[PDB]
Amino acid sequence: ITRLGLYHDLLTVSRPVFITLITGLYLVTNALFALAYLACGDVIENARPGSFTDAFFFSVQTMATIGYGKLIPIGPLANTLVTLEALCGMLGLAVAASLIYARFTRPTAGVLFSSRMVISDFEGKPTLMMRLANLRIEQIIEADVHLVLVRSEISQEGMVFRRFHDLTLTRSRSPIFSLSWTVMHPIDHHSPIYGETDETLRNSHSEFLVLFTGHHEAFAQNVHARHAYSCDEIIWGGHFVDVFTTRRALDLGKFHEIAQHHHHH
Amino acid sequence: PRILNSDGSSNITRLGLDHYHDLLTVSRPVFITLITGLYLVTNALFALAYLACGDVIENARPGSFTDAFFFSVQTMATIGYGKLIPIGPLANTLVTLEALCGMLGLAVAASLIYARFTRPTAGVLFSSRMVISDFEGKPTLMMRLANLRIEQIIEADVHLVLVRSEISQEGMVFRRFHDLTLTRSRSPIFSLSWTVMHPIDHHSPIYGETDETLRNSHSEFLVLFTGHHEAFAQNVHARHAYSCDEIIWGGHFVDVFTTRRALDLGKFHEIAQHHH
Amino acid sequence: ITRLGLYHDLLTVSRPVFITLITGLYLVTNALFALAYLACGDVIENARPGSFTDAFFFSVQTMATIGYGKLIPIGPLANTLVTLEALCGMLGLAVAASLIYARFTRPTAGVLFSSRMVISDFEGKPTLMMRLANLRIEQIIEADVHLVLVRSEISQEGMVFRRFHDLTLTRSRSPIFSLSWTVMHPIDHHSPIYGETDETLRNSHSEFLVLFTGHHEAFAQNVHARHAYSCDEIIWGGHFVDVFTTRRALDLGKFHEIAQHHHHH
Amino acid sequence: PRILNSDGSSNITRLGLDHYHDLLTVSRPVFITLITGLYLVTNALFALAYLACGDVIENARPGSFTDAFFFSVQTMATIGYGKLIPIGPLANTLVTLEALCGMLGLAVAASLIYARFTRPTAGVLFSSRMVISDFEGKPTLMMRLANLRIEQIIEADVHLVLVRSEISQEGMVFRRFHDLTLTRSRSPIFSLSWTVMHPIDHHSPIYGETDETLRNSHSEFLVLFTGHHEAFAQNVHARHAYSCDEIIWGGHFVDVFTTRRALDLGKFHEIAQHHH
Ligand SMILES: [K+]
Ligand SMILES: [K+]
Ligand SMILES: [K+]
Ligand SMILES: [Mg+2]
C-alpha cells in the first residue's frame, strides 16, 4: 500500500555484507584517529613524520590494545587521543558482539507454504486446505496457525470497509511440528465462505492470511511466518498429493503437487 | 484528579517504599557521557592510589597525576605500551586489580549496550480522545491507534478496560476493572491505522451510562496494545489511558486515508461533532 | 519434603560474594600458571629466578593481554603456556560476561504478599481474599494470578491422596499491576470450600497456593512469585484495611493490617 | 515401525532437503576441543601468510613457523609482547586483519558460551510404559513423570496426544492428532512424581478401543511437558512418545514413595499386573 507523511538504520543483511560493513567501520575509525594524531603535529615516537601509514597502524595497535611498543604517544595531546580510542575499541567491541549475539537470535522459521490452497470434499463437507512443512531437522513445538479471511463488505450507514474472519480449523495447533501439516477449514453453515464461489470471492476482493508461530528447538526462541493467498490461488476440486512415500519417507518434491479431475467435454 | 496518567502510568504517590533501569531508558548521547564519565573517574581513583605508594611507575615524572593516569588507561585498556611500566610488588598488585576492573567494565558495557539494543519502542500512536457515536445503529465507544513505522506489527492484540469506583451491598467502595468486548481485538498485519470499537449493548458495563454517570464512578479507560515487531523480531507493548473528559459524545474520527492513496496522521486526532 | 536417591554448581548469590568468587578464580588460575612457568625451569626473560611473584605478575599480564614487555617468554616451552593462557583469559572473559549478562536477566518480581487471607462477605457471599503489591515504580503488565486449594480427599478404591482445585476468582488478570491487588474467591455452591469451616479445612489438611506471573517493564522479561497459606493463616470475618490514604497515596504500612470484630462476651 | 521415536523425535527419512546447532548441543569437553582447535588452525593460517611475505617479523629466526605462529598468538590475543614486532606495510596489514579476527572470535565465543549457559535440560523422567486400568471405576490411560532435581518446576503443563491413522468417507487415509482430556493437566509446584490420567469415558477417542484396534490404526501417544525451572529461571520443554506395545493393559504403577519418607526412582518404571 502507498504511503503518506508524518541514525536509526539498525539493519541486518547478508553474512558476508555484515562482516565487510564491520571491517569498513574499523578502518574509517582508525583513519579518522590517524588524521587527528597528525592534526596535532607528530606526537608518535618512532613514527615517520607527515605519514598516514604510521599514525594509522598506531591507532590499530591502540584501539585493538596491541600496544606493540615501538610506536608510543608523546606528552599530553596524543595521551588524550589514546584514552578516547581505548574507550572507542571497548564500546566498538560491545556494539559488534551486540549485533553479533542479536543476529544469532533473529532466526528464520524455515517454514515452507504450499503454492496454492484447494477446496475439495473432506469428511462429508467442502473444505478449504493448504499445507506447510518444516525445512529443518530440529522440531518446532507448541506451533499454532491462524487462517484469516479478509474481504470487502458494506455496513448500514455505507462506509464500505475491510473485515477479518478467523476461519475455524479442524486443528490449529501441532503439538510437535516435524514433517508436514495440512490445515483444513471445513465450509459449514457457520463459515464466512458458505455458499461462496470462485466468482463471489473475487467480487468481495477476498484474501486468506495464514499466520504461523511456534517455539523452535533449534534457536530456543519463538519463530514466526505468514503467507497470503488471493482467490486466484485456490484450485476448486484440487487434492494435495501424498508426500509420504513408503521405509517411511517425506518427499518435499511432491509438496506443491495438486491433482485435479479434467472433464470429458 | 486522574488515577491513571495518559501514558497508562499510575498517578498515585507511594509511601512505605543499586538502580540499573536508568542506564537502559536514558538518551543515547547521555549514556555515552555516563560510561566515558565512569571511565575517567576510575582511571583517576587508580592514578591517585599509584601516587599514594610513591614513585612505583618506570619513566614517570614524580608526584604527577597525568603520568600515572595515562598509565592507568594503558593498563585498564590492556594497551600496556611498555615504557610507562610498574615497579616491584606494590604497583603490580594494583595492575592485576585494574586488569579485572577493565574486563568486568567491558562485560557490564556489552550487557547495557545489548539490553538497550533489544528493548525497542512500539511504533504506536493513540488517539488523544475517544468517541461514543452510532456504528451499526448502536452507540459504540471508539479510539484508534496507528503504526508510526514502515515495518508491520504482526499478531497484534488490543484490550480496552473500564476501571471505575463501585459500592457493594456491604457498602465497601472499591475500584473494578472490566474488559469491554470489542467488534475486533486482533490485527493479523497492523500496518496503518485501526479503529477499536466497544458496542454498548445491554451486556456492556456502560449500558445506559452518561457523561454524568461515568464522571460519578470516576470511570477511566485503559487501552493495552501488544504485538510482534518484524522491525526488531521482538514483542512490543504500548498502553494509554483516558478520563471521562476525553470522550467526545457524538464524535466521529475523520478519514485519515486522503488521496495518491495516503495516510495523513495530521488528521489522526481530528474529531467531527455536530453543533446546535 | 524429605528426599530419597537415584561440576554442576551453576549458582548465583550476593553481588559482593559473586565479585570475590570471580576475583578468587582469577588469582588461583594466575597462580596455577605461575607454578607451571617455574615447573619448566626459568623461561621468563628479566624474571628473578626461583620466584613466584615474577612468574605470577607475568601470567596476569599474559592472561589480561597487558603483555607489558619487560617479562617475556623464552623459546618453545613457555611460548606454549603463553598460547594456552591467551585462550583461558578470552574464555574466562566470555564465562564472566555470561554469568554477568545472565544475572542481569534473572530478576526479582518485587511482589509483596499479604501475611494472611480473610473470609468475609463481599457482594452478598462469603469470599476468600488475600492481596499483593508491587514494591517497585516500574509497572508489571499482563499479570495473572492462580489461587489453588490443595487438600487430602479419599478415592473409591482407597489410595487416599492429594487433590488440587483452581479456585474461580472474580478477576485473575490485572492488565496493569502498579499499586495493590485484592484477589477474591467467592465461596458459592460450585466452590470446593462451600459449607467448609476453620475445623473442616484443618481436617482435610488444606493449603492455598497463590501463584503470580507478569511481564516486568523493568527487566523486559517474564517474572514469577508464589506464596502458600495454611488454614492457620485465614482470619474468618477479617476485612483488609484500605491502604489508599487521601492527594491519592498508597501506604504499604497498612498492607498487612486486618480489622476483625471482637464479641461482647 | 514407530512413526515417533521414544524421545518424541520423528522417525521418518526426509528428501528434497553453515550449522550452528552442533556447537550449542555438544559435550562441554568436546566444545573446549573445537574452540582451542579453531584457535590453533587460525594462528597457523596466519603464521603461513606472514612467512609467505618474507622476513617481516623483527627478532624472528627466518623461514620459521614456530616464531611467526607465537607472534600471531600475541597479536590475535592483543598481547603484542614488544620484541617479536612486525615490519613495514606488508605485515602491519595482516596485524590489523588479525586484531579483528580475535575480537570477532571473542564475540562468537561469548555468544556460544552464553547460549549454552542458558539452554538448560528439563529435569524430567518419563515412565517407560503406559497402563490402562481402573482408577475411579473407569478404565484410565496413565503414564507418570518425575523431577530429577531438587529445584521445583513451577506452573507445569502436560499434554497427552493420541496420533493415529483414520479413513474419511472419501476414503482418504490420513494421520489425526487428539488431545486426550486429563483428570489434571497442570501442576503448580512439580517437585516429586506426577501420574497423568486420561479417563476413557464415552468422549475419549479410544472408548471401546483394544490392544488390537489401537494396533490397526497405528496409534501412538505423544506426551508434551512444559514449565518454569526455578533452577535456571527459564521455561523448559520435554517430550516422550509411546507405541501400542508400550501399554500394559491392567498395569498399575508401584508406589515410588517408600519409608524415612523417600522417593525410590528405582521403582519408577515398575508396573504390577495380575497373571492367570
Ligand atoms: K605491549
Ligand atoms: K598489549
Ligand atoms: K610492549
Ligand atoms: Mg590487550
mmCIF file of N, CA and C and ligand atoms in Angstrom, chain A residues 61 64-69, chain B residues 74 77-82, chain C residues 61 64-69, chain D residues 74 77-82, ligand 2:
data_model
loop_
_atom_site.group_PDB
_atom_site.id
_atom_site.type_symbol
_atom_site.label_atom_id
_atom_site.label_comp_id
_atom_site.label_asym_id
_atom_site.label_seq_id
_atom_site.Cartn_x
_atom_site.Cartn_y
_atom_site.Cartn_z
ATOM 1 N N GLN A 61 46.846 -0.471 16.725
ATOM 2 C CA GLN A 61 47.523 -1.119 17.871
ATOM 3 C C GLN A 61 47.095 -0.474 19.190
ATOM 4 N N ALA A 64 42.842 -1.682 19.209
ATOM 5 C CA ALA A 64 42.872 -3.152 19.407
ATOM 6 C C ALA A 64 43.623 -3.523 20.694
ATOM 7 N N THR A 65 44.116 -2.527 21.432
ATOM 8 C CA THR A 65 45.027 -2.672 22.602
ATOM 9 C C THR A 65 46.105 -3.746 22.338
ATOM 10 N N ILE A 66 46.741 -3.718 21.155
ATOM 11 C CA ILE A 66 48.004 -4.476 20.889
ATOM 12 C C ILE A 66 49.162 -3.731 21.567
ATOM 13 N N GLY A 67 49.208 -2.397 21.470
ATOM 14 C CA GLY A 67 50.146 -1.512 22.200
ATOM 15 C C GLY A 67 51.616 -1.822 21.934
ATOM 16 N N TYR A 68 51.919 -2.437 20.778
ATOM 17 C CA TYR A 68 53.150 -3.206 20.425
ATOM 18 C C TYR A 68 54.438 -2.659 21.055
ATOM 19 N N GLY A 69 54.569 -1.342 21.270
ATOM 20 C CA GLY A 69 55.723 -0.745 21.974
ATOM 21 C C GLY A 69 56.433 0.328 21.172
ATOM 22 N N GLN B 74 46.364 2.786 30.114
ATOM 23 C CA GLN B 74 47.074 1.821 29.236
ATOM 24 C C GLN B 74 47.084 0.448 29.886
ATOM 25 N N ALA B 77 42.868 -0.625 29.863
ATOM 26 C CA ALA B 77 42.565 -0.942 28.452
ATOM 27 C C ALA B 77 43.440 -2.095 27.935
ATOM 28 N N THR B 78 44.326 -2.658 28.773
ATOM 29 C CA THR B 78 45.384 -3.651 28.406
ATOM 30 C C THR B 78 46.126 -3.250 27.114
ATOM 31 N N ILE B 79 46.481 -1.960 26.999
ATOM 32 C CA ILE B 79 47.432 -1.434 25.975
ATOM 33 C C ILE B 79 48.836 -1.812 26.465
ATOM 34 N N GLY B 80 49.194 -1.370 27.677
ATOM 35 C CA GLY B 80 50.472 -1.671 28.354
ATOM 36 C C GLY B 80 51.669 -1.322 27.487
ATOM 37 N N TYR B 81 51.736 -0.078 27.004
ATOM 38 C CA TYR B 81 52.599 0.364 25.875
ATOM 39 C C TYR B 81 54.047 -0.122 26.020
ATOM 40 N N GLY B 82 54.553 -0.298 27.248
ATOM 41 C CA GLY B 82 55.881 -0.884 27.537
ATOM 42 C C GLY B 82 56.981 0.154 27.537
ATOM 43 N N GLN C 61 49.744 -10.428 33.241
ATOM 44 C CA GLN C 61 49.982 -9.549 32.073
ATOM 45 C C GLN C 61 49.855 -10.333 30.767
ATOM 46 N N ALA C 64 45.542 -11.290 30.947
ATOM 47 C CA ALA C 64 44.862 -9.985 30.763
ATOM 48 C C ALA C 64 45.290 -9.315 29.449
ATOM 49 N N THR C 65 46.164 -9.967 28.679
ATOM 50 C CA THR C 65 46.844 -9.419 27.472
ATOM 51 C C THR C 65 47.294 -7.959 27.701
ATOM 52 N N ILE C 66 47.918 -7.669 28.855
ATOM 53 C CA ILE C 66 48.679 -6.399 29.075
ATOM 54 C C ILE C 66 50.021 -6.512 28.339
ATOM 55 N N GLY C 67 50.700 -7.663 28.418
ATOM 56 C CA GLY C 67 51.912 -8.004 27.639
ATOM 57 C C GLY C 67 53.069 -7.030 27.844
ATOM 58 N N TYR C 68 53.094 -6.333 28.992
ATOM 59 C CA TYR C 68 53.826 -5.068 29.300
ATOM 60 C C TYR C 68 55.190 -4.945 28.609
ATOM 61 N N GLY C 69 55.922 -6.043 28.373
ATOM 62 C CA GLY C 69 57.189 -6.029 27.613
ATOM 63 C C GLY C 69 58.358 -6.627 28.372
ATOM 64 N N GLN D 74 50.285 -13.669 19.850
ATOM 65 C CA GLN D 74 50.489 -12.474 20.707
ATOM 66 C C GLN D 74 49.818 -11.268 20.072
ATOM 67 N N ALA D 77 45.603 -12.325 20.290
ATOM 68 C CA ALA D 77 45.247 -12.175 21.716
ATOM 69 C C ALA D 77 45.492 -10.738 22.207
ATOM 70 N N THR D 78 45.967 -9.832 21.338
ATOM 71 C CA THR D 78 46.441 -8.452 21.670
ATOM 72 C C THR D 78 47.340 -8.438 22.924
ATOM 73 N N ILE D 79 48.269 -9.403 23.009
ATOM 74 C CA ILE D 79 49.400 -9.403 23.984
ATOM 75 C C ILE D 79 50.433 -8.410 23.438
ATOM 76 N N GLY D 80 50.905 -8.642 22.208
ATOM 77 C CA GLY D 80 51.856 -7.778 21.478
ATOM 78 C C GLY D 80 53.111 -7.507 22.289
ATOM 79 N N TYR D 81 53.782 -8.564 22.755
ATOM 80 C CA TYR D 81 54.800 -8.531 23.840
ATOM 81 C C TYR D 81 55.835 -7.417 23.638
ATOM 82 N N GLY D 82 56.143 -7.036 22.391
ATOM 83 C CA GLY D 82 57.020 -5.892 22.051
ATOM 84 C C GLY D 82 58.480 -6.283 21.991
HETATM 85 K K K E 2 49.087 -5.249 24.964
#
